[model samples]
Target: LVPRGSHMFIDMENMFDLLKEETEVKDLPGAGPLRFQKGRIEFENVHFSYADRETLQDVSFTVMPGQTLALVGPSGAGKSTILRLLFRFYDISSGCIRIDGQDISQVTQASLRSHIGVVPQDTVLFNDTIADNIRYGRVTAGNDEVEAAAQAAGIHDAIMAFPEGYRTQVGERGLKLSGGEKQRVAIARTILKAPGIILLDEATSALDTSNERAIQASLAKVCANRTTIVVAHRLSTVVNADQILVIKDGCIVERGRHEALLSRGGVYADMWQLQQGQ
Candidate 1:
């Protein structure tokens, strides 16, 4: 028979093999630490493709510190791709992405991500207590901290209405909560993390109008004084963004404030009119 730890070694080897089959590992030498200051983001002539399919082409923009920049576009217009690049999920094929004058590619991924928080379209939760799900943001945070974050996200009252309060089970992937509840939990978690930069990827897309309005208020509080990038499908939600970008087929077609874009009678205006009817 093999030694006691032999099975563990075999398991590790299997895991490594599985990882290798999924994606090729890059040799990123000289990747150093990152310091996020000001939180200004700049994309200069960025280009990207996936498996021979072009996703973003010559995309460029700037988000000033403490400003909210909203991305609006058709379904396949690369709005989400911009968020993915900011998260470094995939490297660009050409050009550079920078934050506060630091090149993201030159920084360690962990350091780069530490200063950023993301609330995705679909929020995933652990099969654990409600408090545990929120506490996942900062493992060292205390119970009071978690509750405070929940309150800030406007979910604490709802969470406490349950018999078990914070101890209530969320079930697998938060199946026990409604769509709005799940998004609120996600926002609470991100608030607890308190990163300098926040990325919102259609965070309210799945909710109804009433729920969307409620979540939007909580988001406003969370986004205060933070550099926020919003990938929005609904034009109504991004009306107050400091700047709005209209993307089409991987290119930026229009850039302005909501009212200005509406007055321009271009692609953004057409989209606004169409969405208003829906």
Candidate 2:
């Protein structure tokens, strides 16, 4: 059949261009293989820019093994970007990022990332049973393991509330579920992965106080004895952080423990005053 579909031709051309595009990030031939013994993380004068303008500017931090480092600041302070940088989603403009004394840039990306687990604000779900979703982290895990993961994520009771329990079909990326429930699923997935490093990018926009508390408990269980980097939306979540960094316009403006920063009476103090007022 003879047909005219000019739009289809244009779309195909764009797809071809996309396929032809080469990635800037690549594995180095002489890169080191990461042997994850400890979860210590260090950033030394790291500078990054998406293209032209800087997203992170000469930021430096050290997180000891099993310590939790919290990044807290207003949006656009490059708080989330730090987590992405550690994941190496994009290469830094300058300086170094290290995990366990091994430079991330000089290590195989697969090895570096295999030891890290991330529970993002919005998690991806399949059009399958909830058990399968949890099992995605570790496919060979037994059904009881799935239940254990769910229990640890604080979603087991809620799952039991369903007619089918863990077998309930959560259609099309958890459309029938609430945001809090979806986060719980993500937490369950991370529990299965059980990596040495945990990266939590907390959700700020729509979390209620109760849900935050419940999730905090689950997070505590997952983060025990693991190095964690959390981009905390609420200051309350980061109160117990070993170190809290306050970023302003892509640079760390103030840094200390929560009480220490509170005593400093500077940017972090002002934020605490304002956020607490909410």
Off by over 4 Å in 1: 1-27, 173-175, 203-206, 276-278
Q: Put down candidate 1 lDDT per residue, 131-198, tens digits, no spaces.
A: 99999888999999999999999999999898789999896744378878888888999999998899
TM-score of every model versus the real structure: 0.87, 0.87
C-alpha displacement of 251 in model 1, angstroms? 0.7
What TM-score does candidate 1 reach? 0.87
Per-model lDDT: 0.86, 0.86
Candidate 2 lDDT (Cα, 0 to 1): 0.86
Q: List the residue pairs that clash in candidate 1.
A: none
